[PDB]
Design an enzyme around this catalytic site. Structure first.
Site, PDB file in Angstrom:
ATOM      1  CG  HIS A   2      -1.975  -1.113   1.130  1.00 35.60           C
ATOM      2  ND1 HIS A   2      -3.034  -1.125   0.253  1.00 35.60           N
ATOM      3  CD2 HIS A   2      -2.073  -2.218   1.901  1.00 35.60           C
ATOM      4  CE1 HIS A   2      -3.764  -2.233   0.462  1.00 35.60           C
ATOM      5  NE2 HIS A   2      -3.175  -2.921   1.460  1.00 35.60           N
ATOM      6  CG  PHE A   4      -2.332   6.914   0.305  1.00 35.40           C
ATOM      7  CD1 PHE A   4      -1.736   8.139   0.573  1.00 35.40           C
ATOM      8  CD2 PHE A   4      -3.585   6.667   0.826  1.00 35.40           C
ATOM      9  CE1 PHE A   4      -2.386   9.080   1.353  1.00 35.40           C
ATOM     10  CE2 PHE A   4      -4.243   7.641   1.587  1.00 35.40           C
ATOM     11  CZ  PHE A   4      -3.647   8.844   1.835  1.00 35.40           C
ATOM     12  CD1 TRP A   5      -5.082   3.119   1.547  1.00 31.64           C
ATOM     13  CD2 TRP A   5      -5.072   4.309   3.463  1.00 31.64           C
ATOM     14  NE1 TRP A   5      -6.187   3.960   1.524  1.00 31.64           N
ATOM     15  CE2 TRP A   5      -6.204   4.701   2.692  1.00 31.64           C
ATOM     16  CE3 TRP A   5      -4.859   4.914   4.720  1.00 31.64           C
ATOM     17  CZ2 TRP A   5      -7.100   5.703   3.118  1.00 31.64           C
ATOM     18  CZ3 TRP A   5      -5.769   5.865   5.144  1.00 31.64           C
ATOM     19  CH2 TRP A   5      -6.877   6.252   4.370  1.00 31.64           C
ATOM     20  CB  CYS A 160     -16.445  10.023  -6.580  1.00 30.98           C
ATOM     21  SG  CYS A 160     -16.937   9.513  -8.262  1.00 30.98           S
ATOM     22  CE  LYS A 168      -5.197   8.794 -16.154  1.00 35.53           C
ATOM     23  NZ  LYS A 168      -4.005   8.447 -16.968  1.00 35.53           N
ATOM     24  CG  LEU A 411     -26.296   9.035   5.527  1.00 36.78           C
ATOM     25  CD1 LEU A 411     -26.560  10.526   5.352  1.00 36.78           C
ATOM     26  CD2 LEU A 411     -27.608   8.278   5.808  1.00 36.78           C
TER      27      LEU A 411
HETATM   28  C1  LIG Z   1      -8.458  13.774  10.293  1.00 40.54           C
HETATM   29  C2  LIG Z   1      -9.221  13.897   8.976  1.00 40.54           C
HETATM   30  C3  LIG Z   1      -8.877  12.678   8.075  1.00 40.54           C
HETATM   31  C4  LIG Z   1      -9.722  12.776   6.805  1.00 40.54           C
HETATM   32  C5  LIG Z   1      -9.396  11.610   5.798  1.00 40.54           C
HETATM   33  C6  LIG Z   1      -9.704  10.235   6.380  1.00 40.54           C
HETATM   34  C7  LIG Z   1      -9.413   9.130   5.346  1.00 40.54           C
HETATM   35  C8  LIG Z   1     -10.578   8.898   4.345  1.00 40.54           C
HETATM   36  C9  LIG Z   1     -10.184   7.824   3.313  1.00 40.54           C
HETATM   37  C10 LIG Z   1     -11.246   7.734   2.206  1.00 40.54           C
HETATM   38  C11 LIG Z   1     -12.545   7.027   2.622  1.00 40.54           C
HETATM   39  C12 LIG Z   1     -13.506   6.953   1.431  1.00 40.54           C
HETATM   40  C13 LIG Z   1     -14.858   6.297   1.841  1.00 40.54           C
HETATM   41  C14 LIG Z   1     -15.632   6.079   0.598  1.00 40.54           C
HETATM   42  O1  LIG Z   1     -16.146   7.035   0.018  1.00 40.54           O
HETATM   43  S1  LIG Z   1     -15.790   4.453   0.026  1.00 40.54           S
HETATM   44  C15 LIG Z   1     -16.459   4.756  -1.645  1.00 40.54           C
HETATM   45  C16 LIG Z   1     -15.273   5.019  -2.569  1.00 40.54           C
HETATM   46  N1  LIG Z   1     -15.738   5.362  -3.934  1.00 40.54           N
HETATM   47  C17 LIG Z   1     -15.891   4.487  -4.922  1.00 40.54           C
HETATM   48  O2  LIG Z   1     -15.689   3.265  -4.784  1.00 40.54           O
HETATM   49  C18 LIG Z   1     -16.368   5.092  -6.218  1.00 40.54           C
HETATM   50  C19 LIG Z   1     -15.761   4.393  -7.478  1.00 40.54           C
HETATM   51  N2  LIG Z   1     -14.280   4.372  -7.458  1.00 40.54           N
HETATM   52  C20 LIG Z   1     -13.550   5.431  -7.487  1.00 40.54           C
HETATM   53  O3  LIG Z   1     -14.058   6.562  -7.622  1.00 40.54           O
HETATM   54  C21 LIG Z   1     -12.050   5.272  -7.418  1.00 40.54           C
HETATM   55  O4  LIG Z   1     -11.751   3.941  -7.758  1.00 40.54           O
HETATM   56  C22 LIG Z   1     -11.467   5.639  -6.020  1.00 40.54           C
HETATM   57  C23 LIG Z   1     -11.671   7.152  -5.759  1.00 40.54           C
HETATM   58  C24 LIG Z   1     -12.152   4.867  -4.894  1.00 40.54           C
HETATM   59  C25 LIG Z   1     -10.023   5.311  -5.965  1.00 40.54           C
HETATM   60  O5  LIG Z   1      -9.366   5.975  -7.077  1.00 40.54           O
HETATM   61  P1  LIG Z   1      -8.452   5.134  -8.124  1.00 40.54           P
HETATM   62  O6  LIG Z   1      -9.042   3.824  -8.322  1.00 40.54           O
HETATM   63  O7  LIG Z   1      -8.348   6.012  -9.269  1.00 40.54           O
HETATM   64  O8  LIG Z   1      -7.037   4.895  -7.397  1.00 40.54           O
HETATM   65  P2  LIG Z   1      -5.834   5.969  -7.221  1.00 40.54           P
HETATM   66  O9  LIG Z   1      -4.731   5.575  -8.161  1.00 40.54           O
HETATM   67  O10 LIG Z   1      -6.279   7.320  -7.342  1.00 40.54           O
HETATM   68  O11 LIG Z   1      -5.434   5.666  -5.740  1.00 40.54           O
HETATM   69  C26 LIG Z   1      -5.094   4.362  -5.300  1.00 40.54           C
HETATM   70  C27 LIG Z   1      -5.026   4.307  -3.779  1.00 40.54           C
HETATM   71  O12 LIG Z   1      -6.390   4.495  -3.303  1.00 40.54           O
HETATM   72  C28 LIG Z   1      -6.689   3.489  -2.346  1.00 40.54           C
HETATM   73  N3  LIG Z   1      -8.125   3.303  -2.348  1.00 40.54           N
HETATM   74  C29 LIG Z   1      -8.872   2.713  -3.328  1.00 40.54           C
HETATM   75  N4  LIG Z   1     -10.147   2.719  -2.952  1.00 40.54           N
HETATM   76  C30 LIG Z   1     -10.219   3.381  -1.732  1.00 40.54           C
HETATM   77  C31 LIG Z   1     -11.261   3.713  -0.881  1.00 40.54           C
HETATM   78  N5  LIG Z   1     -12.556   3.371  -1.124  1.00 40.54           N
HETATM   79  N6  LIG Z   1     -11.010   4.386   0.232  1.00 40.54           N
HETATM   80  C32 LIG Z   1      -9.728   4.694   0.513  1.00 40.54           C
HETATM   81  N7  LIG Z   1      -8.677   4.392  -0.262  1.00 40.54           N
HETATM   82  C33 LIG Z   1      -8.945   3.725  -1.417  1.00 40.54           C
HETATM   83  C34 LIG Z   1      -5.960   2.260  -2.900  1.00 40.54           C
HETATM   84  O13 LIG Z   1      -5.845   1.303  -1.895  1.00 40.54           O
HETATM   85  C35 LIG Z   1      -4.644   2.933  -3.274  1.00 40.54           C
HETATM   86  O14 LIG Z   1      -3.813   3.136  -2.105  1.00 40.54           O
HETATM   87  P3  LIG Z   1      -2.590   2.108  -1.781  1.00 40.54           P
HETATM   88  O15 LIG Z   1      -3.225   0.743  -1.675  1.00 40.54           O
HETATM   89  O16 LIG Z   1      -1.719   2.264  -2.971  1.00 40.54           O
HETATM   90  O17 LIG Z   1      -2.005   2.555  -0.474  1.00 40.54           O
HETATM   91  C1  LIG Z   2     -18.812   5.158   1.609  1.00 43.54           C
HETATM   92  C2  LIG Z   2     -20.032   5.057   2.423  1.00 43.54           C
HETATM   93  N1  LIG Z   2     -21.030   4.187   1.726  1.00 43.54           N
HETATM   94  C3  LIG Z   2     -22.049   3.714   2.679  1.00 43.54           C
HETATM   95  C4  LIG Z   2     -23.214   2.983   1.959  1.00 43.54           C
HETATM   96  C5  LIG Z   2     -22.761   2.143   0.741  1.00 43.54           C
HETATM   97  N2  LIG Z   2     -24.088   1.561   0.180  1.00 43.54           N
HETATM   98  C6  LIG Z   2     -25.252   2.440   0.135  1.00 43.54           C
HETATM   99  C7  LIG Z   2     -24.257   0.225  -0.164  1.00 43.54           C
HETATM  100  N3  LIG Z   2     -23.105  -0.465  -0.299  1.00 43.54           N
HETATM  101  C8  LIG Z   2     -23.218  -1.769  -0.629  1.00 43.54           C
HETATM  102  N4  LIG Z   2     -21.935  -2.325  -0.639  1.00 43.54           N
HETATM  103  C9  LIG Z   2     -21.859  -3.758  -1.020  1.00 43.54           C
HETATM  104  C10 LIG Z   2     -20.751  -1.570  -0.160  1.00 43.54           C
HETATM  105  C11 LIG Z   2     -20.280  -0.698  -1.399  1.00 43.54           C
HETATM  106  C12 LIG Z   2     -19.269   0.365  -1.203  1.00 43.54           C
HETATM  107  N5  LIG Z   2     -18.382   1.146  -1.019  1.00 43.54           N
HETATM  108  C13 LIG Z   2     -24.412  -2.371  -0.790  1.00 43.54           C
HETATM  109  S1  LIG Z   2     -24.974  -3.983  -1.247  1.00 43.54           S
HETATM  110  C14 LIG Z   2     -26.611  -3.575  -1.228  1.00 43.54           C
HETATM  111  C15 LIG Z   2     -26.793  -2.215  -0.943  1.00 43.54           C
HETATM  112  C16 LIG Z   2     -25.553  -1.624  -0.703  1.00 43.54           C
HETATM  113  N6  LIG Z   2     -25.486  -0.301  -0.392  1.00 43.54           N
HETATM  114  C17 LIG Z   2     -22.127   3.087  -0.298  1.00 43.54           C
HETATM  115  C18 LIG Z   2     -20.791   3.565   0.400  1.00 43.54           C
HETATM  116 MG   LIG Z   3      -6.503   8.308  -9.926  1.00 41.30          MG
END
Ligand SMILES: CCCCCCCCCCCCCC(=O)SCCNC(=O)CCNC(=O)[C@H](O)C(C)(C)COP(=O)(O)OP(=O)(O)OC[C@H]1O[C@@H](n2cnc3c(N)ncnc32)[C@H](O)[C@@H]1OP(=O)(O)O
Ligand SMILES: CCN1CCC(N(C)c2nc(N(C)CCC#N)c3sccc3n2)CC1
Ligand SMILES: [Mg+2]
Ligand SMILES: CCN1CCC(N(C)c2nc(N(C)CCC#N)c3sccc3n2)CC1
Length: 411
Positions: A2, A4-5, A160, A168, A411
């Protein structure tokens, strides 16, 4: 593994989380003065943008990004379609901080390329019950109680990146900038959830579904017909009968929540939530915001008999785009929100949730096995889906807990 993480103040392995006994911060104490005043660097072709979440048109722009680029299943059949009204609700609760909503735009056309959102939450996140007991046994109660007070932190949602900009390394930059903006307001922890496994959840729960319109769910391949239904002459007829619900609620005194119910609903909710290790604390304004009925968005009913509110439930709507079916292009899902039962068993309260949701034309009711959601799964005919929701903290060491010790709905 990871890139980043591994650089972030989160537990790095399952083992590590297994070993944690006390809640508390991971990083060294820092001040607002220590945090860079200038935005995190970004490529010269992009720019940071802070949308105005109250302004219809900026909500629309965020709505479009999510509609076309937010979470979808692996077979690309369903993509969430959170509505503009839902997004204004979710992202502008009482005392929200505009600067915590962070976007990237392409500087030329200003096309919206990425988003992440933080909102305030007051969270109980001190050491869990099972660990305060170990601490008592070891003479370590003071350490275990240090962080008992509810904390004002950040809840992250709606990360997103546009599909054309995937892979990237844009998401790490958005997360760093969001962290910077939150830290500049003297907040140092966040809570977030995801379907994917990242380093490292403090809790995980399966999703459950309750079919309300099984014919449609099968048509769109949300659902299959269980094999044993093939023993019937009319498998679909039997499936529809299986999931049939009353046309009107069964509980005497059920009605929509109104403003005057806010103190009673706050009381019974707060008493119930208090029993879980991780859970939110809501003010009257936050009860009003997250629970009063809003058309198309959130639906909340109280049981009032003899002039006292004794129970309540809420659900919210998240539709999904159905991508590749000939007959439907939308899945209308109801999600179990907060609830509290004091006069009737929880199954009896939640049956009226299903009845109301079905009456209002929802296709399915979804939930995670948090709260006491497991207590009505079987009677009310929910089934486990293949998905999970994993719960994470940023900059907070926390013991692994079961999802039935989590009371935070995301949510
Ligand atoms: C004190 C305040 C703190 C505030 C911040 C707290 C932290 C919040 C953290 C965020 C909480 C979000 C909660 C939600 O909204 S979860 C919902 C996330 N959204 C989606 O799944 C929508 C569809 N997918 C996308 O839009 C993209 O694929 C995303 C944006 C998810 C990644 O973009 P992309 O695919 O273009 O990749 P990259 O090249 O830019 O980046 C790759 C790096 O990203 C790490 N990665 C992939 N998916 C996630 C994920 N869901 N949470 C955290 N990290 C994720 C991955 O392991 C890798 O890191 P590493 O493995 O190399 O280390
Ligand atoms: C990032 C915060 N949330 C919280 C809710 C998540 N939601 C609405 C969700 N997420 C689901 N999954 C499987 C997690 C997806 C993601 N991320 C499912 S399977 C059936 C309904 C459903 N709904 C979408 C992502
Ligand atoms: Mg990217
Ligand atoms: C393999 C069998 N499946 C695959 C689809 C699964 N479902 C409903 C689902 N549904 C999804 N969406 C967007 C619709 C959620 C609802 N309601 C998403 S978003 C990420 C995973 C995921 N998964 C459950 C049934």
């Amino acid at each position: 593994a990871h890139a980043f993480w591994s650089t972030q103040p989160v537990p790095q392995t399952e083992d590590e989380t297994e070993k944690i006994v006390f809640a508390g911060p991971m990083d060294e104490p820092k001040t607002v003065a220590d945090i860079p005043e200038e935005p995190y660097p970004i490529a010269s072709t992009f720019e940071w943008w802070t949308p105005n979440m109250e302004a219809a048109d900026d909500i629309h722009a965020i709505y479009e990004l999510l509609r076309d680029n937010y979470v979808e299943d692996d077979d690309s059949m369903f993509r969430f379609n959170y509505s503009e009204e839902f997004l204004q609700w979710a992202l502008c609760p009482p005392n929200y901080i505009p600067d915590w909503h962070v976007a990237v735009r392409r500087k030329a056309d200003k096309k919206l390329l990425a988003f992440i959102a933080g909102v305030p939450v007051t969270l109980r996140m001190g050491t869990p019950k099972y660990m305060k007991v170990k601490a008592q046994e070891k003479g370590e109660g003071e350490e275990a109680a240090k962080y008992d007070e509810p904390r004002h932190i950040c809840e992250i949602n709606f990360l997103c990146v546009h599909k054309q900009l995937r892979e990237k390394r844009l998401a790490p930059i958005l997360i760093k900038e969001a962290t910077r903006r939150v830290n500049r307001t003297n907040v140092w922890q966040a809570v977030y959830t995801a379907g994917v496994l990242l380093p490292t959840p403090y809790a995980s729960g399966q999703y459950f579904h309750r079919s309300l319109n099984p014919e449609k769910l099968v048509e769109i391949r949300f659902s299959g017909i269980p094999a044993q239904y093939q023993k019937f002459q009319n498998p679909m007829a039997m499936l529809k009968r299986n999931y049939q619900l009353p046309s009107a609620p069964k509980n005497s005194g059920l009605r929509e929540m109104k403003p005057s119910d806010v103190p009673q609903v706050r009381r019974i909710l707060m008493n119930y939530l208090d029993s879980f290790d991780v859970g939110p604390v809501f003010s009257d304004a936050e009860i009003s915001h997250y629970l009063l009925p809003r058309d198309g968005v959130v639906f909340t009913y109280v049981v009032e008999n003899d002039k006292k509110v004794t129970d309540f439930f809420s659900f919210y709507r998240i539709p999904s785009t159905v991508i590749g079916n000939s007959n439907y292009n939308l899945l209308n899902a109801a999600y179990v929100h907060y609830y509290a039962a004091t006069s009737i068993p929880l199954h009896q309260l939640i049956l009226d949730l299903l009845i109301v949701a079905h009456s209002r034309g929802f296709d399915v009711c979804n939930m995670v096995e948090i709260l006491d959601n497991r207590s009505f799964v079987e009677q009310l005919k929910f089934g486990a889906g293949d998905g999970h929701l994993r719960y994470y903290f940023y900059n907070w060491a926390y013991p692994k807990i079961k999802p039935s010790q989590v009371a935070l709905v995301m949510l």
